[PDB]
Each structure stands twice: as structure tokens, then as C-alpha cells.
Write a protein that binds this ligand. Structure first.
Ligand SMILES: [Zn+2]
Length: 195
């Protein structure tokens, strides 16, 4: 309905997204920004205020200097697998690092969208001050925490279910209505947050 909002958010994101040195698909990198541009501007401006940089990567996560301490480190609940932090495409929290071309579900992650799920962690931690670990959201998580699948992951950690609910809410119209169907209280919760 509104293309003007996307364009203004893209300009906010221009003060947030940092493009990598090296070779990558420029069009796909731009597609990731367009998807991030659907997040409420209130959240984006607040990330801009706190100087949160969304770093897009052309290579592996642990190839980057700041995440080199993760090289060879096995993430939690990567029992066997054979994969370490070197094989993780995205990361969110205090910092945001995303590998370009790995947005879709299955590209080394179970999130419905890499960049929206990770940026959610930053908005949760930096902007909303760990709202996923608040009494109100815990009550909702207690009831709706498994309604998006991944019951041993999303259904166990409220910070993860928040991030995925956020991604469902802001990705596209289909996954938004999917969230409203499966998680009415969570949908209502996020809707009030942006009011
Ligand atoms: Zn996560």
C-alpha cells in the first residue's frame, strides 16, 4: 500500500547497514535491505540512535575480525552436527552480522528470514531492553511459544520465539497473517509495541 514508508526506512537503514569489502551479489544485498525496510521506522531510528551497525558479509562470519574468536567454536545444542560458528550465516544481539545470500529458511539456519530474525535480537536487546524476558511476554510465551514450530528451540527460549515472531510479523503479508492466526496474543503484543 505504501511505498513512501519503505523509501524513508531505506534512508534510515543507509545510516545503519554496512556493506563489506570484497565480492558479493549486490542485488541480493539490496534485497536484504528492502526486507529490513519493512520493519517499523520507530525501531530503525532507535537502532540508528544507539549506533547499531547491521553488517552484511561477503564471506563466513568467523572470517570477520571481530568474530574471529568464534572460529572453531561449537554453538549450543550443536550436538554432533559437524558445524561450528564458522557455518552460521547470521548473528543478532549486541551486534548484527549477516552473510549475503543466506536469507531464506534452510540456508544454514531455521529462521523464516535471516536478517529479520537477527535484527529482532538487536531490537529486543538494545531498543526494547530484553522485552522477551519480561513478565508479560513470558506469560504469552508460556502459551504460544510452540505455535511456530521448532518446539525444542523456539518453544524453549522466549528470546528466540520473540525474534521469530518479529520476523513473521514484518517479512511479508502472508507470514504476518500466519502469525495472527497461530499466535493471536503475540500478534497483538507486537502490534501494540509499534503503536
Ligand atoms: Zn536467534
Amino acid at each position: 500500500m505504501d511505498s513512501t514508508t519503505i523509501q524513508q526506512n531505506k534512508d534510515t537503514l543507509s545510516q545503519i547497514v554496512v556493506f563489506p569489502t570484497g565480492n558479493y551479489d549486490k542485488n541480493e544485498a539490496n534485497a536484504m535491505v528492502n526486507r529490513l525496510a519493512n520493519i517499523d521506522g520507530k525501531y530503525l531510528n532507535a537502532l540508528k540512535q544507539n549506533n547499531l551497525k547491521i553488517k552484511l558479509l561477503s564471506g563466513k562470519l568467523t572470517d570477520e575480525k571481530e568474530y574471529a574468536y568464534l572460529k572453531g567454536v561449537v554453538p549450543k545444542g550443536w550436538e554432533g552436527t559437524g558445524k561450528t560458528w564458522d557455518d552460521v550465516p547470521g548473528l543478532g544481539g549486541s551486534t548484527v552480522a549477516l552473510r549475503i545470500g543466506f536469507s531464506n529458511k534452510g540456508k544454514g539456519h531455521d529462521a523464516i528470514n535471516l536478517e529479520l530474525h537477527a535484527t529482532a535480537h538487536a531490537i529486543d536487546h538494545i531498543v526494547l531492553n530484553d522485552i522477551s524476558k519480561s513478565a508479560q511476554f513470558k506469560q504469552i510465551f508460556a502459551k504460544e511459544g510452540r505455535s511456530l514450530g521448532n518446539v525444542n528451540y523456539l518453544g524453549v527460549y522466549p528470546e528466540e520465539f520473540f525474534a521469530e515472531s518479529f520476523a513473521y510479523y514484518y517479512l511479508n503479508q502472508d507470514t504476518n497473517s500466519k502469525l495472527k492466526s497461530a499466535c493471536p496474543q503475540t500478534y497483538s503484543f507486537l502490534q501494540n509495541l509499534a503503536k
